[PDB]
């Protein structure tokens, strides 16, 4: 088959600046007629969406920030200028030869100013308590960059701590994460203070939320 290799695998590009995404075919395409290489943007949980078709044609409804070029074995998608809405994975695809094939994808991160998380802690609801279960939840919302550390009665406990990050928000280019410390009934009832401290390169001091019981 015709293997399409994309480069880069990932990149981080500031707002207003240029992203260059490359596609290399394992062999050259044939000169008789058009060259059927297309480019798509795909966000989480959606189908891919068409940007450029037949190497260089702009799909109607797509802004001219997106341009395609290429020939033979090298094809280029340029996004200039980049905007918040571009946070996505991009794919080239060929249907010059069977079977049709897609590149491995390029993940575009939007680089924006550093942003401190807003942190909220929640005790378990009494509905959950009636089921003999106790989960303590902490939300760490709208921060940048993605790298972040979170620590959950005086002391510490990593056993029962399920974490989960979102993808990049396509309006403000931030990330959020969610930490859920879960533990048994008579175990939870048996303690005092619950704190999620979070640390992040927006400050020296960890952001601390907590409640007494």
């Amino acid at each position: 088959d015709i293997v399409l290799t994309q480069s880069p695998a990932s990149l981080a590009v500031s707002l207003g600046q240029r992203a260059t995404i490359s596609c290399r075919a394992s062999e050259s395409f044939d000169s008789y007629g058009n060259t059927f290489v297309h480019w798509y943007q795909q966000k989480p949980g959606q189908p891919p969406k068409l940007l450029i078709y037949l190497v260089s044609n702009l799909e109607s409804g797509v802004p001219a920030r997106f341009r395609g070029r290429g020939s033979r074995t090298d094809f280029t998608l340029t996004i200039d200028p980049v905007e918040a809405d571009d946070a996505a994975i991009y794919y080239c695809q060929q249907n010059n030869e069977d079977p049709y094939t897609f590149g491995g994808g390029t993940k575009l991160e939007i680089k924006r100013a550093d942003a401190a998380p807003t942190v909220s802690i929640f005790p378990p609801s009494s509905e959950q308590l009636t089921s003999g279960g106790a989960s303590v939840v902490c939300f760490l919302n709208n921060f940048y960059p993605k790298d972040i550390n979170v620590k959950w009665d005086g002391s510490e406990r990593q056993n029962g701590v399920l974490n989960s990050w979102t993808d990049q928000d396509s309006k403000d280019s931030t990330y959020s994460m969610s930490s859920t410390l879960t533990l048994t009934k008579d175990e939870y009832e048996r303690h005092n203070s619950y704190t999620c401290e979070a640390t992040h390169k927006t400050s020296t001091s960890p952001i601390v939320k907590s409640f007494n019981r």
Partner: protein
């Protein structure tokens, strides 16, 4: 306008088959091929093949010859893809897309995708727990102990969506858990009503948990 509409998510046992519909409207169905794609979780797409609705003809990516069959119902502008002898390797999102007519072209119109999960594990509905606690205020919804994916979450049926973060589910002891936060003005809550809407298609669960002040 053109729309391609696929079925909802599917849990299928190993060894069984599943049939995925793709209903088309907004154009003359027999003018264009219908193509089908597979996207495993965290992966790129693979083209399975296509079918010409006008004349019944098909072409399969050789790699999918023992896996996929295409048919169409011209009568209802619906294309179908059957996947047989399913294994864990078939767990993936499958997409239809409108293909070439008079000549080859791009995939301009896509269906929304349908998630197929191959497993013989039992189906488990989630428990939905509300999370209650400053000009802004953040409220939560905890969707815990379900199988399989997905669940969907909205707040006040989608009208309230501006300050929502819904977090990808984590698999733990053979069960998924997911959370979702929402932030609104102090003036609006607890003053007026906020509830999370949670559905788990695989169990036909649809719950509305209202966020009560503690």
């Amino acid at each position: 306008e053109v729309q391609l509409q696929q079925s909802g998510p599917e849990l299928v046992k190993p060894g069984a088959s599943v049939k995925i519909p793709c209903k088309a409207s907004g154009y003359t169905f027999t003018d264009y091929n219908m193509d089908w794609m597979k996207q495993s979780h965290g992966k790129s797409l693979e083209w399975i093949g296509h079918i010409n609705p006008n004349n019944g003809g098909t072409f399969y990516n050789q790699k999918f010859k023992d896996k996929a069959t295409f048919i169409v119902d011209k009568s209802s502008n619906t294309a179908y893809m059957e996947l047989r002898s399913l294994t864990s390797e078939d767990t993936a999102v499958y997409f239809c897309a409108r293909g070439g007519g008079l000549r080859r072209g791009p995939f301009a119109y896509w269906g929304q995708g349908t998630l197929v999960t191959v497993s013989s594990a039992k189906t488990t509905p989630p428990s939905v727990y509300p999370l209650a606690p400053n000009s802004m205020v953040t409220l939560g919804c905890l969707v815990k102990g379900y199988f399989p994916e997905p669940v969907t979450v909205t707040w006040n049926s989608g009208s309230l969506s501006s300050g929502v973060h819904t977090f990808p589910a984590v698999l733990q002891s053979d069960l998924y858990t997911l959370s979702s936060s929402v932030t609104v003005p102090s003036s609006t809550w607890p003053s007026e009503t906020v509830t999370c809407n949670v559905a788990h298609p695989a169990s036909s669960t649809k719950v509305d948990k209202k966020i009560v002040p503690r």
